[PDB]
Amino acid sequence: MNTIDIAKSYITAIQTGDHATLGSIISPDVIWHQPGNHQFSGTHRGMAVVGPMLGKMMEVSNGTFAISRADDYMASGDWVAITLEFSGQANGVTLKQAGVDLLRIEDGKIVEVRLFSADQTQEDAFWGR
Amino acid sequence: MNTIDIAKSYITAIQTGDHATLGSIISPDVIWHQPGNHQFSGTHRGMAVVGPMLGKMMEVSNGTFAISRADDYMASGDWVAITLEFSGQANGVTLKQAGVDLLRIEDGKIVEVRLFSADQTQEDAFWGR
Ligand SMILES: [Cl-]
Ligand SMILES: [Cl-]
Ligand SMILES: [Cl-]
Ligand SMILES: [Cl-]
């Protein structure tokens, strides 16, 4: 079992809303870097913070924020880049754009997450203040 | 002038073979992570090493290794992810595949590079041993 397997499990769990997997395969000490200039932007540390933030995100997006398509999983050292599309409809914003999730995986767990968006102005409006 | 501007300058310079730009906008102390299992794979530090390695790469690929298409430039903290396609024809291998370049940019310079390839088996064969 390799880092791409773990990354695929992570994406499948996001896509299918499997909180059990997400709560288990993400490190309790996860460092999560969310880009941009909206209420969830910044670096967050620990599932104590990240779990509730993911929940608030689901609330703010009326459950519509989604990785609508995953394209490629690529490994480099302990990192995996996943190229993808995400979408959503909330705060009057129709979100549809390319992104990349960067995951750092160690000992079977995602220890660091850095997200990238192709249109950060649109994503910022989506999440809101 | 922002990190995406620097990333675009970097990609344009690779694409047009502008060694002057590359030699100037890449940090002398650049940390360069090349994935896979071929003769250039591993982490390399310093332009004293990276410059000559880029030259050897051009030689090994008969000057054909190319970023054939750049798709999106995305910023997250001091990192920029560039989704792209690369191609080449060398060592009996026709290379054509998606990739992502991750650049860390500080004070106007690229200080760290991490490359990702969609088909590392094919890229490994391309570069060879
Ligand atoms: Cl998908
Ligand atoms: Cl809406
Ligand atoms: Cl292009
Ligand atoms: Cl050939």
Residue B51: enclosing H or E segment and its boundaries? helix B47-60
- DSSP letter at B110? E
**Which letter, b or e, does each residue of A18-42 get, where b requires 16 or more Cβ atoms within 10 Å of its Cβ?**
eeeebeebbbeebbbbbbbebebbe
- DSSP letter at B77? T
- Give the integer Cα–Cα distance in Å for B47 and B51: 5
Residues 6+ apart with CB under 8 A from A52: none
Is residue A44 within 8 A of residue A62, CB to CB? The reply is no
Strands B26-34 and B109-117: parallel
Match 């590079």 to its residue by tokens. B113
- Named by the residue before each, gaps in chain B exceeding 2.5 A from C to N are none
Q: How far is CA B33 from CA A30, A39, A122, B102, in A?
A: 23, 33, 32, 10
- Give the integer Cα–Cα distance in Å for A102 and A111: 11
Nearest by CB: A100 against B33, B74, B120: B74
Is residue B1 within 8 A of residue B108, CB to CB? The reply is yes
Residues of A in contact with B100 (CB under 8 A): 74, 81, 83, 100
The letter for the amino acid at B102 is L
**Which letter, b or e, does each residue of A102-126 get, where b requires 16 or more Cβ atoms within 10 Å of its Cβ?**
bbbbeeebbbbbbbbbbbbeebbbb
Angle (CA) B38 B42 B43, round 5°: 155
According to DSSP H, which parts of chain A are helical? 3-16, 19-25, 47-60, 120-127
| CATH number for A88 | 3.10.450.50
- Give the integer Cα–Cα distance in Å for B65 and B58: 7
Count up the domains in chain B and report the number. 1
Of B79, B73, B122, the C-alpha closest to B97 is B122
Q: How far is CA B47 from CA B25, B28, B113, in A?
A: 11, 5, 12
Is residue A92 within 8 A of residue A11, CB to CB? The reply is no
- Give the integer Cα–Cα distance in Å for B48 and B29: 9
Task: Report chain A's C-alpha Rg in angstroms.
Answer: 14
Of A125, A33, A114, the C-alpha closest to A80 is A114
Query: How far is ligand 1, taken at its centre, from the CA of residue A85, in Å?
Result: 9
Residues of B in contact with A102 (CB under 8 A): 81, 102
The token duo for A27 is: 């490190």
CA B15, B62, B111, A110 dihedral sign is positive
Residue B120: enclosing H or E segment and its boundaries? helix B120-127
The token duo for B30 is: 């650049």
B17 lies in which domain range? 2-129
Is residue B116 within 8 A of residue B33, CB to CB? The reply is no
Chain B residues bordering chain A (beta-carbon distance below 8 Å): 33, 35, 43, 71-72, 74-77, 79, 81, 83, 98-100, 102, 114-118, 120
- The structure was resolved experimentally with X-ray
| Burial (CB count within 10 angstroms: exposed 0-12, middle 13-18, buried 19+), residue B83 | buried
Is residue A101 within 8 A of residue A4, CB to CB? The reply is no
